[PDB]
Design a protein around this ligand. Structure first.
Ligand SMILES: [Zn+2]
Ligand SMILES: [Zn+2]
Ligand SMILES: [Zn+2]
Lengths: 1131, 117, 101, 51
């Protein structure tokens, strides 16, 4: 029955494999989008108010149902055919499906003359579709079906195709809503502040933040204030309580202080009462609120109405926005004050801003919902204006012409295309970085980009606290994978078994709590709240309970049985403070864990047995979760959980550590993400090395996707001979690194050989490189289109001619065909022409606008595709193919942060060799190891020697006590090798033995995208910028290198004044001006007629020539634009 | 000394503020909303414990013994019920510097005795 | 003072559409409101109308030489991007002095 | 620097109408040892005490 330790390493990984058979790696994206389409769009459409318009006749126009068909593309002819994602990629279409809404317009004029007209399936917009979602044409297709459609079966999906560009929505971090968080700002007028970003269940407005603060000590005592929304002045809490109908101080403290035996709380609230005694009735308090507001009505009536509306709608919407909710709002605001007092009295800890239990991940669904709310509101507005301008004339109108569908369509398309998350007009208030271009450089880069999280703290911020690896990231975020540049700690990555909750309605839970012995908050007396336990659901205090323990037992039983409580519902019992917080909302990152009985796992051997035959008896992960054996625990419920790292922790020990565990890790290696799960032996490296590899696995070459032959990507690198690593971890089985690997096993020798590998460089074998070692192919796609925008000027693909075309370069166009497009198989060098495009003029009647190769490439045309774009003019894509043979300067890396460029390449006779004539493919310098402490590199090399000599794949899973260095060495000594991986090598040049026995063996190396040929650049008098006549910027522009301020300072320190003048004047922008010797302002010179005159001074004899930079002339002219007179006085 | 609690009027249920009656030279607690008055019984109006000599045993609740994440010990039996097992934990409360002190709670149900060594 | 064409070059795009500089668009606004104010003072206009026109002219000139005025709205252009005034042309890094001199 | 708070244990306000019979019982010894001779203006005394 029990899984014994000897079977555990199989059982756990069997369980893990079942998880990845059920979910995958992009499950969060697909589930978010599916919830958005199934629920969020319908909720948004129904939550909009019916637009009642009347001059008389009236019309309501109620939207009642939505229909999202499959993605479809319509041609000029109008025939209807399904649009496949690959066709969208090739034709630069948007993989979107039409959204139709049912509309009901009832005519009501008078005399009960009512009649309803329903417009079924009114086309309301187009919604882009996430690939492999339920509403994707690739849904449920087999691998054969996907290959029939020219799709990769290993492609995870989880992205959109907007204008042929694959866009991926990055999950955005945000502070959780409807939760009270008591912080303390050191530099502020308030000692403690308790904030609550409140938002109603079905979002319709932004988060309304309410603060309840305490004024810092230094009138008599500490005063509690409340910064309500839409009010620009602090308001005492007692005033707010009275404005809600609680005038008696006893009632207010009944709502705030639940234990009247506690004078400390009492004296700390007393200043607030003493400050609010002149106001003692609800109307006067409402008048005070309205007066403190930023729109103080001259008459107290409208002041009181405004205060009523604010306190009913903007104050704590999550508690309830309807009327008669003042009791719930009063209880909740009293809870906020109670929490603030507990913090000020030291009875509760301040809340941690960085705790991921306090955060939420805004995924594709809830982000598209924000867009859709804004866009549907704008659409209903436009419909209101259109219908108003017609009914004002007293006649009917056609809603089909009122609905301008471009709002929703173009809005979603623009937002996903650019990443600016918001309305196109508010292009600066909008937050960019959402919806990035999917990284297709290697399969690991694609997976990681699809599992990418973002902390929008702002890269400019230099506070390290949000960048720090918090304790609560354990199991939810990769500890290693993070960019090492300016976004350290802000851009994160999901751990492998991390699941972001999609969201759920609290209705069944609330109904069960009602049927259960919970007492509502309006029905109780406050005297009961002392000993009772509060119950919050999605932040709303809904009631109280008397035995929280058996309530938690009941709820956990219900969630483990897949009863009314779904698996993703978090249920935290804080014991010391008697809250029970239940969460069903979306964005809660959680992970699966094995539940533990008294001191035993519930995962018995029968579950492993049924999981082994997963493909026959359809016993899956969901059956494991439904059995009550596995549980999803979120960051906030982990605080109440006692984990076992392994079932070995559940053994009874000579001194028991815990003996009351509640859960167990499925495997600790699941704390790593996609790119860190490729590192072998990451627990033997320094952690920065693991981070650098997690970044560098994403630039590694491989086969980024199986269907690369049909993709017209702008840039693509494919390795000739990708190999799976000889030394692998058990997590790559689910990353599909074995099916799409990104490196080669290289016989690497760590040695000092000729000095060409010093300081992070490598010596490669020229003979190996000749045999296809780390050879790659580079595919570059050029796009072009001939626009017939108007009869004024039209472009067209056609072989240009020297007699008709004007802007025709001296490059030869013979490689083009009569259609103007080069043919595949044609070898093209730099500056060559691949598309001959000519544009009609207003060298006559047509000018050359041909597409050249990006300079200095020298490839062969791989293929040419011609089609029609969305509007329907001819559209061409040409993929050119360039074989990249590794060379000096190309960057290579192992899986341990050990990067370096090729210093030199030696032939096989020049490389050092073992007694059996094995030469290293790569030689790396021993000095790269000691400071870096990448012992995982050495253990991987030794394990790889054992694996190659044994005919297996080494197990480098991080935390594995069945694999240590002594075992690997003992294994290697059985194959006739030195047990530590050393060998006697001979000098290739002289054949003499090397005195020091070299450490050599197979290690998995990666070829990175950074090849020297894509970086080398030179300039000598090339093109210049228009504004300031200085060299351009970039290799692509043939630009010059920037001689910056620091270079100026260095050369000033050198004392090199002529070199400094050469760099900053003569090699950048030499120029001449003519200055009036009297006024010092630039004069008018006419060198052809030799007439120089200053219009200002009315002189034409006292002019002087001045040699100045063009940028300085431009500066002085831009100062004269500002009415400044910079007078260059030559005397 | 001990703290002093707030007391409310019997008519308007607002807090009673302190006042002095010169005629009898006696402390009274009177409401500044209604016209109620009361004869005080403590004679102390304000108390500040600067030292903050708070007995944290009063802040503990027996329910904490149900926490699976707290450590348990068999070495400190309960003086009230004789149960062997007991959870222990530190103060973890602000304004307490010498907070390495351990507080124990009996894990027996319905006993919930709390103490300190 | 309206600068010359070198300070605000009209760059030609791939086709024939000549795109004007931000300074040129701003000067267009300034000349528009200046002519509008000139006619409104010359012909029938209310005092408050002339006042509004003068206020708008002030806004245009100020945002031509300095666009980041606190409180005031930023001078806008097509695509919703604020215009680059003479001050941002040389305010700091990547300006004339640090970025080109 | 040492303020009275750094060395103070606890402050309290009492309503002591006559110092001869104090509100507290343990402070009756030294208060009478101080009051049996008139050191200050006993008439200019307020019943509010700050111990
Ligand atoms: Zn002059
Ligand atoms: Zn009263
Ligand atoms: Zn006990």
């Amino acid at each position: 029955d029990e899984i014994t330790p000897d079977l555990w390493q199989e059982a756990c990984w069997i369980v893990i494999s079942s998880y990845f058979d059920e979910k995958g790696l992009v499950r969060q994206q697909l589930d978010s989008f599916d919830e958005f389409i199934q629920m969020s769009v319908q909720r948004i459409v129904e939550d909009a108010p019916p637009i009642d318009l009347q001059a008389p006749p009236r019309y309501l126009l109620k939207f009642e149902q939505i229909y999202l068909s499959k993605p479809t593309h319509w041609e000029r002819d109008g025939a209807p055919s399904p649009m496949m994602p690959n066709e969208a990629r090739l034709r630069n279409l948007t993989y979107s499906a039409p959204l139709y809404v049912d509309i009901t317009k009832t005519v009501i004029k008078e005399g009960e003359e009512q009649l309803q007209t329903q417009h079924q399936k009114t086309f309301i917009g187009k919604i882009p579709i996430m690939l492999r979602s339920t509403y994707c044409l690739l849904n449920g297709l087999t691998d054969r079906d996907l290959c029939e459609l020219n799709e990769c079966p290993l492609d995870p999906g989880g992205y959109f195709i907007i204008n042929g560009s694959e866009k991926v929505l990055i999950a955005q971090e945000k502070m959780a809503t409807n939760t009270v968080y008591v912080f303390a700002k050191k530099d502020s007028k308030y000692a403690y502040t308790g904030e609550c970003r409140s938002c109603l269940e079905n979002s319709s407005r932004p988060t309304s933040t309410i603060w309840v603060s305490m004024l810092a000590r230094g009138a008599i005592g500490q005063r509690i204030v409340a910064t309500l929304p839409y009010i620009k002045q602090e308001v005492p809490i007692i005033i707010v309580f009275r404005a809600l109908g609680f005038v008696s101080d006893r009632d207010i403290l009944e709502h705030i202080i639940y234990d009247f035996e506690d004078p400390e709380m009492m004296e700390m609230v007393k200043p607030s009462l003493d400050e609010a005694f002149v106001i003692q009735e609800q109307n006067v308090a409402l008048n005070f609120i309205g007066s403190r507001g930023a729109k103080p009505g001259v008459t107290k009536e409208k002041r009181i109405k405004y205060a009523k509306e604010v306190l009913q709608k903007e104050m704590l919407p999550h508690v309830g926005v309807s009327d008669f909710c003042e009791t719930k709002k009063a209880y909740f605001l009293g809870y906020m004050v109670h929490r603030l007092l507990l913090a000020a009295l030291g009875r509760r800890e301040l809340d941690d801003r960085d705790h991921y239990g306090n955060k939420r991940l805004d995924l594709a669904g809830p982000l598209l919902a924000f867009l859709f709310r804004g866009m549907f509101k704008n659409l209903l507005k436009e419909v209101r204006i259109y219908a108003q301008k017609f009914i004002d004339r007293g006649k009917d109108f056609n809603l089909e012409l009122a609905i301008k569908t471009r709002i929703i369509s173009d809005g979603l398309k623009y937002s996903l295309a650019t990443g600016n998350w918001g309305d196109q007009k508010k292009a600066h208030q909008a937050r960019a970085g959402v919806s990035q271009v999917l990284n297709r450089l290697t399969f690991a880069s694609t997976l990681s980009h699809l599992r990418r999280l973002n902390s929008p703290i702002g890269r400019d911020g230099k506070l390290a606290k949000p960048r720090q690896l918090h304790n609560t990231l354990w199991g939810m975020v990769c500890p290693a994978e993070t960019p090492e540049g300016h976004a350290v700690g802000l851009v994160k990555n999901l751990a492998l078994m991390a699941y972001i909750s999609v969201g759920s309605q609290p209705s069944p839970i609330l109904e069960f709590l009602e049927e259960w012995s919970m007492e509502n908050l309006e029905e109780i007396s406050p005297a009961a709240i002392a000993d009772a336990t509060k119950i919050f659901v999605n932040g709303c205090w809904v009631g109280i309970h008397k035995d929280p323990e058996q309530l938690m037992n009941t709820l956990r039983k219900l969630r483990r049985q897949m009863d009314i409580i779904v698996s993703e519902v978090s249920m935290i019992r804080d014991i010391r403070e008697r809250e029970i917080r239940i969460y069903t909302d979306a964005g809660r990152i959680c992970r699966p864990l094995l539940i533990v009985e008294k001191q035993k796992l519930l995962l018995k051997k029968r579950h492993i047995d049924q999981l082994k035959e997963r493909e026959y008896n359809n016993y899956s992960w969901q059956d494991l979760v439904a059995s009550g054996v596995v549980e999803y625990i979120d960051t906030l419920e982990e605080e109440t959980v006692m984990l076992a790292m392994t079932p070995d922790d559940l053994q009874e020990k000579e001194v028991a550590y815990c003996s009351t565990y509640t859960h167990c890790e499925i495997h600790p290696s699941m704390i790593l993400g996609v790119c860190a799960s490729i590192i072998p032996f990451p627990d033997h490296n320094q952690s920065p090395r693991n981070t650098y590899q997690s970044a560098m696995g994403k630039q590694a070459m491989g086969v980024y996707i199986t269907n690369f032959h049909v993709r017209m990507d702008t840039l693509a690198h494919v390795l000739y001979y990708p190999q799976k690593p000889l030394v692998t971890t058990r997590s790559m089985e689910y990353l599909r690194f074995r099916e799409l690997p990104a490196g080669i096993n290289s016989i690497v020798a760590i040695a000092s050989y000729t000095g060409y590998n010093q300081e992070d460089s490598v010596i490669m074998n020229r003979s190996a490189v000749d045999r296809g070692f780390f050879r790659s192919v580079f595919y570059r796609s050029y796009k072009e289109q001939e626009s017939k925008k108007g009869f004024d000027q039209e472009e067209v693909f056609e072989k240009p001619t020297r007699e008709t075309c004007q802007g025709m370069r001296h490059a030869i166009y013979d490689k083009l065909d009569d259609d103007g497009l080069i043919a595949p198989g044609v070898r093209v060098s730099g500056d060559d022409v691949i598309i001959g495009k000519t544009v009609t003029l207003p060298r006559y009647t047509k000018r050359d606008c041909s597409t050249f190769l990006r300079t200095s490439e020298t490839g062969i045309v791989d293929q040419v595709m011609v089609t029609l774009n969305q509007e329907g003019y001819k559209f061409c894509k040409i993929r050119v193919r360039s074989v990249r043979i590794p060379q000096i300067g190309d960057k290579f890396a192992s899986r341990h942060g050990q990067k370096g460029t090729c210093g030199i390449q030696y032939r096989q006779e020049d490389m050092p060799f073992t007694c059996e004539g094995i030469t290293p493919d790569i030689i790396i310098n021993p000095h790269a190891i000691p400071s870096r402490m990448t012992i995982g590199h050495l253990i991987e090399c030794l394990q790889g020697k054992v694996s190659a000599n044994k005919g297996e794949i080494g197990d480098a899973t991080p935390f594995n006590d069945a694999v240590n260095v002594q075992k690997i060495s003992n294994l290697l000594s059985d194959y006739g090798y030195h047990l530590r991986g050393n060998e006697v090598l001979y000098n290739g040049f002289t054949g003499r033995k090397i005195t020091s026995q070299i450490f050599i063996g197979p290690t998995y190396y990666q070829r990175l995208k950074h090849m020297v040929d894509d970086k080398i650049h030179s300039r000598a008098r090339g093109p210049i910028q228009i504004l300031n006549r200085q060299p351009m910027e970039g290799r692509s522009r043939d630009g010059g290198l920037r001689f910056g301020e620091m270079e100026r300072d260095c050369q000033i320190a050198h004392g090199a004044a002529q070199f400094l003048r050469e760099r900053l004047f003569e090699a950048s922008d030499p120029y001449q001006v003519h200055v009036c010797n009297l006024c010092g302002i630039m004069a008018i010179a006419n060198t052809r007629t030799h007439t120089y005159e200053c219009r200002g001074c009315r002189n034409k004899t006292q002019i002087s020539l001045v040699r100045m930079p063009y940028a300085c002339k431009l500066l002085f002219q831009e100062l004269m634009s500002m009415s400044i007179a910079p007078r260059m006085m030559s005397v | 000394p001990g703290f002093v609690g707030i007391r409310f009027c019997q008519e308007c249920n607002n807090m009673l503020y302190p006042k002095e009656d010169k005629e009898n030279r006696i402390l009274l607690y009177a409401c500044r909303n209604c016209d109620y008055q009361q004869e005080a019984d403590n004679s102390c109006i304000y108390v500040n414990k600067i030292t903050h000599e708070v007995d944290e045993l009063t802040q503990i609740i027996a329910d904490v013994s149900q926490d699976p994440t707290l450590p348990r010990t068999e070495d400190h039996p309960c003086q009230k019920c004789g149960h062997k097992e007991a959870v222990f934990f530190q103060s973890h409360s602000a304004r307490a510097e010498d907070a390495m002190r351990l507080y124990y709670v009996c894990t027996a149900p319905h006993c919930g005795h709390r103490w300190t060594e | 003072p309206v600068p010359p064409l070198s300070v605000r070059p009209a760059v030609v795009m791939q086709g024939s559409a000549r795109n004007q500089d931000d300074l040129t668009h701003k000067l267009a606004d300034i000349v528009k409101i200046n002519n509008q104010l000139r006619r409104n003072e010359q012909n029938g206009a209310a005092a408050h109308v002339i006042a509004e026109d003068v206020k708008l002219l002030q806004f245009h000139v100020a945002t031509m030489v300095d666009n980041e005025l606190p409180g005031l709205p930023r001078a806008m252009q097509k695509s919703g991007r604020p215009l680059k005034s003479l001050k941002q042309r040389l305010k700091g890094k990547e300006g004339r002095v640090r970025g080109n001199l | 620097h040492t303020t009275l708070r750094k060395v103070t244990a606890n402050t309290a306000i009492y309503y002591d109408p006559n110092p001869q019979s104090t509100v507290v019982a343990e402070d009756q010894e030294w208060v009478n040892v101080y009051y049996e001779m008139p050191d200050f203006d006993v008439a200019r005394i307020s019943p509010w005490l700050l111990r």
